[PDB]
């Protein structure tokens, strides 16, 4: 049983390596992980947190749940990462999202794609939760339209592919909800608006939450595997770190 | 693709699916000759089926389930070495 | 590997190698005097 997982990792690492060579040869489609199910089977998403979450992180975890139409929130009391990952694989979960905080302020967000990765780690900035809005009302939970703006590099395409597949395929053309990911110097701004088509343009109203995410690590494996090969990591101490852009 | 079948398919590729060859790669047997003797003696099962034919070729789905038969004196030796031989399982 | 290795195993073995690349003595004197 562990044998099948051990074998499939070797095939997965081999497939990513081969796909890298063909891409590099082409340098001289949808990623292999998402290729099989892209546009076929809708995602199954679990939103959890670190152990003993504060009330705010729980509120934020509930908001990330409402962002994705097929997301379910799970309480992480005493659950261990190998058991959390193994349980998610048993239950048909496609993506696992784990949130971290510091004194009730969301700090980090990690996305792990099952069964074999990738695992992407973000850092949250300028987080403004819908609970911080008075008389906000209830959200609309339709399959939203997506906007991915200013993603140019191959890594940017990799990040778009990871975030794109957290939503269902084929939103209705008249769906009034739009989720935008706007890259501005490697700081992805995430907004959620509901729009009305007027007789001379479009008027949008922001729903929330607001936050900026910046990818700082991307590994070829699930979040439990700390030995997983690093696909990309953000160098902080190189002398071009303060102006270099990647996405 | 169809073209690669022209050159990928090789006798060595088929020989690699051979049950004693799979067993050697699994470290179940030190040598291919050792694996054949174990298969003949009936210590090896592929899924719920006991296989005594060394010529049997293992498909990829069944590759994960090649293991020792439960009551094999060999499997007792493995567990005894680890001091993990649990008599309730009779193995 | 008497019959060779398949492509996935060759990739695995190459990866592991790179990481890895990264009578007076017998006797002892007692009851010294």
């Amino acid at each position: 049983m562990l044998r099948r997982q051990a074998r499939e990792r070797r095939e997965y690492l081999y497939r990513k390596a081969q796909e890298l060579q063909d891409s590099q040869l082409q340098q001289k489609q949808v990623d292999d992980e998402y290729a099989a199910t892209s546009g076929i089977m809708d995602p199954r998403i679990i939103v959890t947190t670190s152990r003993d979450p504060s009330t705010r992180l729980s509120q934020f975890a509930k908001e990330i749940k409402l962002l994705f139409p097929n997301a379910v929130r799970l309480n992480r009391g005493n659950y261990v990462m190998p058991n959390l990952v193994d349980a998610c694989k048993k239950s048909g979960t496609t993506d696992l999202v784990v949130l971290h905080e510091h004194r009730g302020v969301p700090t980090s967000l990690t996305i792990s794609h099952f069964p074999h990765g990738p695992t992407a780690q973000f850092s949250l900035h300028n987080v403004v939760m819908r609970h911080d809005i008075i008389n906000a009302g209830n959200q609309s939970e339709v399959n939203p339209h997506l906007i991915f703006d200013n993603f140019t590099t191959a890594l940017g395409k990799r990040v778009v592919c990871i975030l794109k597949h957290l939503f269902n395929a084929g939103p209705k053309k008249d769906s009034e909800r739009v989720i935008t990911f706007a890259n501005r110097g490697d700081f992805i701004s995430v907004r959620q608006h509901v729009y009305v088509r007027t007789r001379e343009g479009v008027e949008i109203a922001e729903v929330g939450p607001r936050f900026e995410m910046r990818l700082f690590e991307l590994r070829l494996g699930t979040l439990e595997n700390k030995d997983a090969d690093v696909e990309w990591q953000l160098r902080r101490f190189i002398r071009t770190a303060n102006k270099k852009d990647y996405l | 693709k169809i073209s690669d079948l022209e050159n990928k398919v090789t006798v060595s590729a088929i020989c690699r699916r051979r049950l004693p060859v799979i067993m050697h790669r699994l470290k179940m047997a030190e040598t291919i000759q050792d694996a054949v003797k174990f298969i003949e003696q009936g210590h090896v099962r592929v899924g719920p089926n006991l296989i005594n034919d060394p010529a049997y070729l293992v498909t990829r789905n069944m590759e994960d389930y090649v293991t020792w038969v439960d009551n094999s004196k060999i499997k007792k030796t493995l567990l005894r070495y680890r001091n993990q031989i649990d008599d309730f399982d009779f193995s | 590997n008497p019959y060779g290795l398949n492509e996935v195993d060759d990739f695995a073995s190459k990866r592991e190698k790179v990481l890895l690349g990264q009578e007076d003595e017998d006797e002892e004197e007692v009851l010294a005097m």
Partner: peptide, 28 residues
């Protein structure tokens, strides 16, 4: 060493599995 510990087959089998201070050293 961590993968080898991780991906260890429990069915692996090897035939090897079957197998005064001065006075104490002198006596031994």
């Amino acid at each position: 060493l961590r993968e080898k510990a991780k991906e260890r087959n429990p069915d692996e089998y090897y035939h090897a599995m079957h197998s005064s201070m001065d006075q104490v050293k002198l006596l031994k």
